[PDB]
Write a protein that binds this ligand. Structure first.
Ligand SMILES: Nc1ncnc2c1ncn2[C@@H]1O[C@H](COP(=O)(O)OP(=O)(O)O)[C@@H](O)[C@H]1O
Lengths: 340, 20
């Protein structure tokens, strides 16, 4: 019975691996697209909603300036993003439709999800009911079990990176810091409020930090605010290490117990790491109502169904200065991204 | 109230990953 899931990952790891050892590469070109708007603009990031020319399909094209990625020492990570991204496949994993590059940029043509960054919707609602926090949570539990099975580590779990597709389910994005390792790593990456203590103290860490961020995420969904916060990141890091949590009057004694384990400084006791595995999470009382297979198939009534105004410029979001994307007449950083 | 203190702060908008 549970051999289904035991026999599922196998099939998926084989599927994953084959793609990870023989990456897909340069599978479309800029000109085969028409830029529609700029959905964001980062220090090196950038997401320009586009429409595929030959088919009228819309994609969220992510554009990374080559020279910046390097300056920010994000080469390995940027390559980690593409490589892991073209191999994985999961219901809650935004699909990278196309990839390619030119003289000045690297392009990752992501699937466009017209639902709504869970952030805005969360800050708008204030906080999600436990039942609802559970709904999204569950999907994360599963998506990690998928990722982790492939020796993958997300490292950037937070509402922001969670999109709510039209059916009301989640699609994870932003794999900038995802990496495939079996030992333990050391880079300092993630978002202040979601960093496990072993990252802050830079001890060296594993997939355990992902189960920590879940706690933080679950807590921030149910509370309405992160379990650890302040003005400057230096402080955040402090509140975290001291490791003392306080729950809201309205938290079920069941949420707190679960959260008391996810947000656990002690690696030998925290859920997700221990021998029994993801079942100390999956089998917790707070997840009693949850039917794990119901969700994978997505046969569950979503709590919130975004009023999406169809494909493209539905409505709202926010406007940025439509910066042109230039392609130098010279190739920039050839050897570096050769495998991109 | 913890909620207001949160709201009063500046880390209530879209947060940026660290890696400068
Ligand atoms: N595949 C996608 N479909 C729809 N919207 C997306 C997609 N990818 C990114 N976005 C939107 O574009 C924005 C890009 O801004 P950005 O700061 O780069 O996000 P982040 O750095 O958190 O990954 C996101 O906040 C989100 O609203």
């Amino acid at each position: 019975e549970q051999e289904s899931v035991k026999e599922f990952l196998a099939k998926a790891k084989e599927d994953f691996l084959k793609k990870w050892e023989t990456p897909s590469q340069n599978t479309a070109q800029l000109d085969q697209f028409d830029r529609i708007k700029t959905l964001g603009t980062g220090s090196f990031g950038r997401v320009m909603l586009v429409k595929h020319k030959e088919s009228g399909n819309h994609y969220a094209m992510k554009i990374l300036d080559k020279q910046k990625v390097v300056k920010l020492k994000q080469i390995e990570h940027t390559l980690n993003e593409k490589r892991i991204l073209q191999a994985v496949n999961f219901p809650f994993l935004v699909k990278l439709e196309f990839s390619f590059k030119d003289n000045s940029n690297l392009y990752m043509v992501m699937e466009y999800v017209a639902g709504g960054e869970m952030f805005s919707h969360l800050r708008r609602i204030g906080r999600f009911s436990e039942p609802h926090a559970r709904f999204y949570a569950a999907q994360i539990v599963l998506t990690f079990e998928y990722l982790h099975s492939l020796d993958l580590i997300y490292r950037d779990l937070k509402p922001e990176n969670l999109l709510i597709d039209q059916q009301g389910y989640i699609q994870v994005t932003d794999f900038g810091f995802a990496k495939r390792v079996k030992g333990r790593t050391w880079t300092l990456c993630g978002t202040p409020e979601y960093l496990a203590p072993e990252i802050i103290l830079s001890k060296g860490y594993n997939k355990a930090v992902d189960w920590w961020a879940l706690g933080v995420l679950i807590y921030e969904m149910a509370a309405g605010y992160p379990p650890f916060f302040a003005d400057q990141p230096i402080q955040i890091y402090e509140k975290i290490v001291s490791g003392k949590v306080r729950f809201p009057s309205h938290f079920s004694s069941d949420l707190k117990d679960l959260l008391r384990n996810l947000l656990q400084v002690d690696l030998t006791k925290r859920f997700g790491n221990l021998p029994n595995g993801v079942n100390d999470i999956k089998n917790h009382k707070w997840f009693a109502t949850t039917d794990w297979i119901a969700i994978y198939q997505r046969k569950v009534e979503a709590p919130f169904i975004p009023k999406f105004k169809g494909p493209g410029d539905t409505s709202n979001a926010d406007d940025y200065e439509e910066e042109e994307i230039r392609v130098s007449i010279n190739e920039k950083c050839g050897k570096e991204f050769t495998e991109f | 109230t913890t909620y207001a203190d949160f709201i009063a702060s500046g880390r209530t908008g879209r947060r940026n990953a660290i890696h400068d």
